[PDB]
Design a protein around this ligand. Structure first.
Ligand code: HEM
Ligand SMILES: CC1(C)[C@@H]2CC[C@@]1(C)C(=O)C2
Ligand SMILES: [K+]
Length: 405
């Protein structure tokens, strides 16, 4: 499980962290990654896991490297190397300058003006899902809400049938948290197999859905190619199916465990947007990276062309050098420093949709089910990867303490 140490890597920088199965996982996935920020651990380490790669452990370095696309390229942005090599989504597998023209098209389908066309439907689905669960006095939150709420909104946006969710969700998860049955390349190709006939159909007969808009789009005034459209749509599916889905479960687990924070938002609902931001910091969940374009000395460490570096978006906001008492959730925190939605030229385009889904969930859940807890005797298990998540989140409550709107 440990790749031979490259000749240029010194032993004193070796820390064999496994991003797909970190040793301290039972403590919580954020806690497990935060072992990289213990006082004896250097700012930049090499792990022999997952083929061997660097890890920047501190916000300062993570931010610097995300800004410097000349040295730290997105051409191979996933670990392990085979995944990064196969990864060809647009815009994420591109560096500036070529990357930038594709962002505007992606903005047309997932950006703020769209969140606006979707506002009422987002609100309606959250309320309907929560009301359906409310009288039961229990739910399996991952399957009962965290998945169907954002995924059904995405499938609506993309004009895709809801009965396709199990297949698409399985494939997406193999790209971020592989079970071992499929390589990244096999999962990606299966996703493209799905998207190919649909992109063709919607270039022939355009609708108003996101796939039609991307497939018939222009990038800096020239037509998108069918294959650029495919590479963008694949990314949109992964964002739709495996980001907010996981984040909602970290947030709801925290609220189930912290009646004081629930009460704060019930009594002071105007604090919900700020709470969303603080939860985005504390339960940050993404970690991808970059590949070195040249030999480069970075913070006193010799990096070689072709070396991969994991730059965990998750870690910046958990760094005590960015936020004091970083594991503490404080909704009144004055400067909430984080890179949860990335940093540099690839800043998340889905972040407005994500925040709306989070804020609607917090408001509409606490309106109906203010008082809830983790199920008796349950120990909540997390899972780690490119995007981390919660395996299961059984919640209970007394229906007498709930409110039908
Ligand atoms: C909590 C929710 C989310 C988080 C934490 C998140 C995180 C991120 C991060 C860290 C990146 C930068 C990756 C890099 O630099 O290589 C990114 C980019 C992106 N995200 Fe999000 N994302 C979320 C939700 C979404 C959603 C819901 C969508 C769409 C449905 C989406 C679409 C995109 C797109 C298209 C990019 C590519 C931007 C580019 O490469 O220029 N994201 N996201
Ligand atoms: C790293 C991401 C969260 C960002 C959007 C989905 C994701 C898995 C990507 O491939 C880019
Ligand atoms: K690649």
């Amino acid at each position: 499980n440990l790749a031979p140490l490259p000749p240029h890597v010194p032993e004193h920088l070796v820390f064999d962290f496994d991003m797909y199965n970190p040793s301290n996982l039972s403590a919580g996935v954020q806690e497990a990654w935060a072992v990289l920020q213990e006082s004896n651990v250097p700012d930049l380490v090499w792990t022999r896991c997952n083929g061997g790669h660097w890890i920047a452990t501190r916000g300062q370095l993570i931010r610097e490297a995300y800004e410097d696309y000349r040295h730290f390229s997105s051409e191979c942005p996933f670990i392990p190397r085979e995944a990064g090599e196969a990864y060809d989504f647009i815009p994420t597998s591109m560096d500036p300058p070529e990357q930038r023209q594709f962002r505007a098209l992606a903005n047309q389908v997932v950006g703020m003006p769209v969140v606006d066309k979707l506002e009422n439907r987002i609100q309606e689905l959250a309320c309907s899902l929560i009301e359906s669960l409310r009288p039961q006095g229990q739910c399996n939150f991952t399957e009962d809400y965290a998945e169907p709420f954002p995924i059904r909104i995405f499938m609506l946006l993309a004009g895709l049938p809801e009965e396709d969710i199990p297949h698409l969700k399985y494939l997406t998860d193999q790209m971020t948290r592989p079970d071992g049955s499929m390589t990244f390349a096999e999962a990606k190709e299966a996703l493209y197999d799905y998207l190919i006939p649909i992109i063709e159909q919607r270039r022939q007969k355009p609708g108003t859905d996101a796939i039609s808009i991307v497939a018939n789009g222009q990038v800096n005034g020239r037509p998108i190619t069918s294959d650029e459209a495919k590479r963008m749509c694949g990314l949109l599916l992964v964002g739709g199916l495996d980001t907010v889905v996981n984040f909602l479960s970290f947030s709801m687990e925290f609220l189930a465990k912290s009646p004081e924070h629930r009460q704060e938002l019930i009594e002071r609902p105007e604090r919900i947007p700020a709470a969303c931001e603080e939860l985005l910091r504390r339960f940050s969940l993404v970690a991808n990276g970059r590949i070195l374009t040249s030999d480069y000395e970075f913070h006193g460490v010799q990096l070689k062309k072709g070396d991969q570096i994991l730059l965990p978006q998750m870690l910046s906001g958990l760094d005590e050098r960015e936020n004091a008492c970083p594991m503490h959730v404080d909704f009144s925190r004055q400067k909430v420093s984080h890179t949860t939605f990335g940093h540099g030229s690839h800043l998340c385009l889905g972040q407005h949709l994500a925040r709306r889904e989070i804020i609607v969930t917090l408001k509409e859940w606490l309106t109906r089910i203010p008082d809830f807890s983790i199920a008796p005797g349950a120990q909540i298990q997390h899972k780690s990867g490119i995007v981390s998540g919660v395996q299961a989140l059984p919640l209970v409550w007394d229906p007498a303490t709930t409110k039908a709107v």
